Design a protein around this ligand. Structure first.
Ligand SMILES: [Ca+2]
Length: 260
């Protein structure tokens, strides 16, 4: 743990809030302190919140606006960049309640991203999304480094595996307008979640009930997946969680799935 007040504290579930700039910019003592706090969170709750990440608030907001413009496209323009292969994991997915658009790295042979035609206010969609993908990738690399530093192994231990950039950026939109059997653990190393003000995410407590992951402004939610638990011989938890309709208006979220 560190100086900040928990993001979630309920029913024995404690999800910490950590100032990530203290890992990136602090001296060796402060860096280690923050890294261990990050590891501690993944070892107990399997979830943490980060603040003061290098991804700036104004860029996040622009990216959310850009996502909104994409989803306002007519249906056929979105189907024209439709999802293809499971190995691809790229493109638009229509409902079948909610819709999504998935972007991967630009240089995977035989699996290019299906980019929409850019006219009017969609001009800059591609450059914006590739930017955000790269910044999410850098953040993924740094979070794995915090885990390594926290464990007391070499900071760069995970770099080779995350440097391939084998990640998916997923834009989600729930048009206006409770779920069960959406309960799951993620498959990959870590997942970054940028949630809008309305929330919807719930994480299981050690006792066994689902607590709301209350949205906090300019914060990113990070959780470990099964692959990280595996790498750690189950010292790090891949915690069960689910998304739920909150207690009416349209909802947006952005997630970055690392090594899915
Ligand atoms: Ca999940």
């Amino acid at each position: 743990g560190s100086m900040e007040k928990a993001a979630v504290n309920e029913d024995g579930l404690v999800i910490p809030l950590i100032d990530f700039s203290k890992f990136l910019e602090g001296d060796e003592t402060l860096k280690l302190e923050t890294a261990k706090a990050i590891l501690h969170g993944f070892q107990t709750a399997g979830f943490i919140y980060l603040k003061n990440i290098p991804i700036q608030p104004d860029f996040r907001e622009h990216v959310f606006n850009t996502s909104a413009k994409f989803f306002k496209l007519p249906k056929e323009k979105k189907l024209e960049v439709g999802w293809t292969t499971p190995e691809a994991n790229r493109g638009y997915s229509a409902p079948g309640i909610k819709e999504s658009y998935e972007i991967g790295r630009e240089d995977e042979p035989g699996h290019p991203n299906p980019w929409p035609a850019e006219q009017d206010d969609l001009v800059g969609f591609k450059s914006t999304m590739n930017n955000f993908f790269d910044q999410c990738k850098a953040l993924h690399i740094e979070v794995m480094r915090a885990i390594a530093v926290g464990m007391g192994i070499d900071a760069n231990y995970f770099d080779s595996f995350v440097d391939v950039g084998d990640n998916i950026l997923r834009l989600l939109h729930y048009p206006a307008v409770q779920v069960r059997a959406g309960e799951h653990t993620d498959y990959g190393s870590i997942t970054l979640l940028f949630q809008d003000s309305r929330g919807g995410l719930q994480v299981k407590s050690p006792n066994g009930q689902f607590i709301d992951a209350t949205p906090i402004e300019n914060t990113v939610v990070v959780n470990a997946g099964d692959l990280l638990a595996r790498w750690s011989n189950d010292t790090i938890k891949s915690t069960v969680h689910r998304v739920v309709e909150p207690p009416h208006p349209p909802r947006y979220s952005i997630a970055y799935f690392c090594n899915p």
